[PDB]
Enzyme design. Sequence first.
Site, short mmCIF file in Angstrom:
data_model
loop_
_atom_site.label_atom_id
_atom_site.label_comp_id
_atom_site.label_asym_id
_atom_site.label_seq_id
_atom_site.Cartn_x
_atom_site.Cartn_y
_atom_site.Cartn_z
N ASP A 191 0.82 -1.20 0.00
CA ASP A 191 0.00 0.00 0.00
C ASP A 191 0.86 1.26 0.00
OD1 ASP A 191 -2.34 1.37 -0.11
OD2 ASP A 191 -3.05 0.76 1.91
N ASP A 220 -10.64 4.73 -2.56
CA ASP A 220 -11.32 3.84 -1.63
C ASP A 220 -12.83 4.00 -1.71
OD1 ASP A 220 -8.93 2.84 -0.59
OD2 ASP A 220 -8.90 4.38 0.98
#
Lengths: 479, 455, 479, 479
Positions: free
Chosen positions: A304, A358
């Site tokens: 990430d 997201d």
Amino acid sequence: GSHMRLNLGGAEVFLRAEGLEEAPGGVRLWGREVRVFPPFPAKGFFRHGWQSWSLAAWVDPAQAPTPLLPEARRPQADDPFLLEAGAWWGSGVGALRGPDGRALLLGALDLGARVLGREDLLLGRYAGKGGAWFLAYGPEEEVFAAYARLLPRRLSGRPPRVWCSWYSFYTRIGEDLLLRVLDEVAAFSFEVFQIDDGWQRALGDWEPNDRFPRGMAFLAERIRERGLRAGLWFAPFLVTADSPLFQKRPDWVLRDGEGRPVRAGFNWGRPLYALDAGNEEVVEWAADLVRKALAWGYDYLKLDFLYAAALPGAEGEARYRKAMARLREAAGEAYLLFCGAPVLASLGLADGLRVGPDVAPYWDNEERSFWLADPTGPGLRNALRSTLHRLWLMENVHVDPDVVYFRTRFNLLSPEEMRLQEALAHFTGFKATSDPPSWLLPEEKGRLEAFLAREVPVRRLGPYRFRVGEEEVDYAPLL
Amino acid sequence: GSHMRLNLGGAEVFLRAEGLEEAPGGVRLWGREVRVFPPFPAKGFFRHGWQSWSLAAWVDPAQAPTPLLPEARRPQADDPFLLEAGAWWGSGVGALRGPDGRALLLGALDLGARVLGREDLLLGRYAGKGGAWFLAYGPEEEVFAAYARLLPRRLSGRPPRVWCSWYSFYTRIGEDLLLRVLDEVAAFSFEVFQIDDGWQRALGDWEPNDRFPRGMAFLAERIRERGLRAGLWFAPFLVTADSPLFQKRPDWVLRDGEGRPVRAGFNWGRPLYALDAGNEEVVEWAADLVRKALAWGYDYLKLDFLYAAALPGAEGEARYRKAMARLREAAGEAYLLFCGAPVLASLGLADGLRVGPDVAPYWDNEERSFWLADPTGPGLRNALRSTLHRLWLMENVHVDPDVVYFRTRFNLLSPEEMRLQEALAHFTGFKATSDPPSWLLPEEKGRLEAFLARE
Amino acid sequence: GSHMRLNLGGAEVFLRAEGLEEAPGGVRLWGREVRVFPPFPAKGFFRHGWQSWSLAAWVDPAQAPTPLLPEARRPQADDPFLLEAGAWWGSGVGALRGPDGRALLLGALDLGARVLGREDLLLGRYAGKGGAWFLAYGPEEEVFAAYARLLPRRLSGRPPRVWCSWYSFYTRIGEDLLLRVLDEVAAFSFEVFQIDDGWQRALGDWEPNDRFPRGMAFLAERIRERGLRAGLWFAPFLVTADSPLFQKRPDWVLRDGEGRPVRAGFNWGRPLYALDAGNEEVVEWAADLVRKALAWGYDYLKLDFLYAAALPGAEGEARYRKAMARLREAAGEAYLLFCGAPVLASLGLADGLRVGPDVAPYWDNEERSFWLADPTGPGLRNALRSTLHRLWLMENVHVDPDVVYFRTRFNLLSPEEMRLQEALAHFTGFKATSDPPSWLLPEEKGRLEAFLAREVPVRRLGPYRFRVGEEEVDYAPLL
Amino acid sequence: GSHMRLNLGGAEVFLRAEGLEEAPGGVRLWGREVRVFPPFPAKGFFRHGWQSWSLAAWVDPAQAPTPLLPEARRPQADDPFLLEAGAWWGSGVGALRGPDGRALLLGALDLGARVLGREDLLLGRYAGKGGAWFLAYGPEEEVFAAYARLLPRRLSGRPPRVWCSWYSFYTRIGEDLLLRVLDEVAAFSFEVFQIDDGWQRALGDWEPNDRFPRGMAFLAERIRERGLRAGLWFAPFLVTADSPLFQKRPDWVLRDGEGRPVRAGFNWGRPLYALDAGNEEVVEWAADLVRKALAWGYDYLKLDFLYAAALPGAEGEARYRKAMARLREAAGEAYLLFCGAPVLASLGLADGLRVGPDVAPYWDNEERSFWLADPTGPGLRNALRSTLHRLWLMENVHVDPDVVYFRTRFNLLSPEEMRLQEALAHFTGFKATSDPPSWLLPEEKGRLEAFLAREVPVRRLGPYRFRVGEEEVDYAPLL
């Protein structure tokens, strides 16, 4: 370079490049900068953002881009150059749209490129040394499909079915909690149980905190005893000024020409910095994170904030690719889910790649999305928008449209809105959720399982129109 | 360059440089740029200024540096880059002070380098081609001492005892005045009678004016007839727009990329311009000034505003050192005192070097030190501050702390303050004053003579 | 108001006032704002600063005035209006001089006036209640004496012979040091042994500090035991943030229309604030400092920074006059030297009035006088410049040019420089010094006693040319 | 005015006012501006925002206020003057807090006042003509209680139990939908069924839209046939540029001195304007809205966006109070819930008064609350914060802390966070919800009813500490 004339998709197109050769579905231009002139008034420009969360949509080349805000968050939103510039620049690939349903596409084939988009011009430019281009004109889907046929691929079977721990508990996770949840989840047709952010002590201190007292290799054993694979989340090259690593080894921080730490954004309420992915010592340290997690029993790894290894933009894609190749080499046949990563520069290395912001338990945060003009923030809308504009990568990687919501508890999304995100999970085949089964009503639990257990057929009818099973789904109004 | 790990004076020091090797007192790095990371939370940064009048002191790297005013005076205060930069940059050398009282020191070993101090690192950057560095961790006095050993050196025995005209008469000197003072100065145990600013016609017109009717070589004769050596003062590369030289040879003026005379400061009520010390016709003209002053019978030369030959800063230290090496050799074995000069870039060439701002007959001008934020202005306080932080150079040159005051007439300094400056003169051994004996009380006349005998 | 023509000094003058009537030496105009047009081209304007340390000098009305720096020091330099303005404004009186050496004068007979000078008019304006004006045209020294006659006067005999502690020890005074200096000063023909700044604990704490252990009344008795009157120094209406009085009585601080302390300068390294001279409680606290000093044995008092009670300028002169009235009553017949006071507004209340900046042991601090454009700082030239242009006030108060220097120890002044100040002390009659006799060579002590003991006759030949004794002294070079 | 000295709560307090007289629990000062000087270093200042949604909290007087953003929304956030100013100004009442748990309170008793707060000063100032002040020093709760004892009150029994239609369906309401919901709600111990925004055609066009086909008097009949009262929502003096009213009667728009419509904020995606509450014609039109709704069968009226009638701030409280008195007069004994209204200026006229920003199905929107620095936006946190600081109004009006959430579906709030808002409903006695019963799980439905059916006892332990029933609730961490 030289002026050149071309018959591209039954149209006369004029270009400047230092070279040209035929290629499947268009031509292969050369040169560190190339300019292409559309044989029509351009109605729109495909602005392709740099990384996962960045914006990917068709825009109006005439109207000016708006500054993103706060400036604290620009390095974690996009290639800082694309935001700072007062023209419409894109990363890697750009395209102009004719009034006829057809696209003039200019796409790089090497790292470090950007593409300017005017109403009269497509301008490709490499940050570093020059390289190769793919140019093509034709139907919108065909040219993006022809382009992607010239980029690395790593399609490695079907994409796993994942229970992620994030879009429920966020960081509020612990060993006792997740074991209680693991028992619920094991009753469904998942394939991976992925623990997300929350298990570590700090960024750069990739060991369990005091909420995970028995350790992470214990958690991976209890997961595999259920027939599942164990998934783990890292932000390898991200560090904050309060991490031990930032203070024990200040020579690992990516710094500018004046020895100031390069700013990587603002999250967890504090400023973010990167580790220098050009430092061979650092890259070996990140690789031993992969081996460590593999040694614990985890064969699924969500890597990430990967843009950090590529700061400050296209310029850093050179070091990014080298460093990611070492991680890829260390992971072996394990699964790497790239997140917040330079989209094009990860093809070939990633098994699965996030292509959008997201998702969130809500449609849109208007204050972030409009007043701050930041379409990289969490939200179902901002997820769907970039994801529809990166689906053409499905033939190069597993395209994760992020988790799918089935719950109505602790969730502001409406059922119809939830189904928009669910349908992309069927189209991409990347089926994941974070809904703990406790928070699901009896009817919702059946829906989760029918989602994991069945393989729904899906046909693409246009850019934003899909037929999933027998229902038709349109996305045109959302844009 | 590549990342290196080092155990230096008991600590784990991380650094980035092209090359590393052992040195006395620490290690020696190579690279046009080098970065050293302190193994501690740095409590202070040794900001070393460029030239004689520049600030040299420990600062707090957290606080942003105050802009210096007025902007016309910046080229005669420091390296003009250090004064524009909003970070803490020093010239040639920098150091960080750990909470244990010890220092981590990065110092250049070749010309034209700067050092950046944050609390998390020391960054050294060469303006020109790359070069060598000395890096060391230890007691604050030992690392600087060990740094000084690796720089050039030129120690010409005991530094001589001088009577300077400047800090009493300033520019109001003349032949009949200085003959009268010579007669009384010759009763004290001086060695040099140095004539300062005031004898010349203009900057770059270094011939006697009408207040020196019989000329400068006559005055040298009268000084030597008392067993003293004759001293003379020059600002070789300085020139004003009203100077004859400025108009007769405008090709000798230092000009920037667009033909505009480089600005070199603001003194004597006018703007100042430089001569191009890169132009070998200028260096020769300068080298002939030295010859002419020896011809007249002067064997002690105060060479002033020497930062002019090194404009614009680190980038000019090459041309500066070369031009000074010519004068150093036209001087032969004459004594050269460097003033307003690049400090480290002069080592090995000067016999004596001014290391602080001018002393003055007052402690501090609060209007220049504070509201104009200019610590390079005259003042005993400003002079002591830089001098103290440049004492480590006593192994390389005669460290000149400027003149000592013994008078109380025409002088606002307290007696306690004077004893400070006097003490520093003893320590460095460079003993000079500017007081006419006719201005001294009987008790001050004794103190002056007691100070000139060396023990 | 009305347009009016009159003949004045054999010139035709046009003016704009509400009323006109005759007067000695010219005429008297009435009007809140009056306008006067010179019948000639104006070569110079008489800029008259507000308070003691302010600039009084002739100026070119053409060239714009230079902004005085730092901004923090403007309330202790002048009337803050005069400095912020971009025209040439003066306090109370202005004049224009025609090429013939004559001068057209316009001067208030009332409080709170300013005068504006252009090359083509003299504009008078009352800040508060409109008042009377005096208009004259004639020789330059004539018009000013005529004006002085129409103002308040308070001549209390001969001005005393003072020993002031300030211009030698500054704030480094103490009981034991001054007792020993007292011993030697008592041999000379002094009349007052004045203690300056340094004896107090803090501004608004006017009580002896630890350097005066036996209390201020002891010192005063030893001073008169030696045949001398005792002098003490006060800045009654001045206070700082760290003063006890500032925190204990915040209702005594002068505040602007929005509750914020009015800034009163910057001295002793800390911002200065004023006490509200229109609060009886303050003016009574102030008059009790006079009473306390008189009780202590002092009958010469140097009242300083008196502009603090008249801030923010003309407008405050009405409070100022009424508060100084109280301290005047409270003093009885004691000698009050006003310092940093509004010049015109103090006439009739003060016994001696300082009319220039501090002399200093140097001619000019070029950094303050030139780079900061501040002619109100200590320095013999700055002192001389204003004092020469305020000598016409000898009709109305004892004019104080500040101390005379005789020493060469601890003094950068030249001997020819010191004689310029010594001449002015002869001309005004105000003879004071700070030289401690210890610091005087024998030939110096002799001169100091001849200065005190003799009454040198002195005559005025021009604006800047005097004859003191039989020596002629000319001040034109400094201008 | 005059300087005055007072012994207020065993402390010496100094003030300037034009008058003073004793009063219950403190004193009554007079004057158009008054200044009060605290007998201590002030540790904090009670910044009281103008209207319902505005911020009411203790702040640091030293640190500067931050500009609210976007500027489009300032008129619907607070008194525009309080936002624009660079000092800490408050509406109506302000207070300084001593290091001893005690408050110096300055509160107006007439309309149109503001109170500045410094660390050394409390400055009251009336926008228009002067008026009366209440000053008091003592325990935090006692002085605010003593102050409120001097303001109008209209406590009219217990506050009703209300089902509001807003915090569920928002504007997505219709006649068929609400009838289906009415049936569910009637099974609980509610007293009012209040239809919120959504029934009208436009602002100023206060008639039913095509989703309410049988009309609003039909809906009020079906409600009363259930034993309930009928509630209705209006925004009387609010209009947008696309309303018929704005175009049929442009002389009803509140405009500035240059005939431009006064801006009332930005909501529903378009700019908001006001109707002139000084126009007698308009006030009669708004009164006939009250009678119309009364004629339809509605005895509960939520009057909303009331700051519009008071634009642009304190200045307009004069016209506001007159206009609201006419509405109050028209409503008779019906219930008026004031919302978005000037808090102090509505006492005596309102039966119930919103004291905080809207609640929301989430704790805080960080992007609006922090980056835009706007604590007036919807959110449980921003609701609770101003509401705790206006509870002392409970003895003058019914204090609505807004709706209470019981559902976990379509709601991001956590149970513990929901209970914080629930407890204020018990403390104030204003029990309302929007949760449709369909969205409630069996256990949640029982909780709703036990909330309506029982009267929980509640004691206040400190400023932010309460004991409800037998659980203790602390609010200190939220601030």
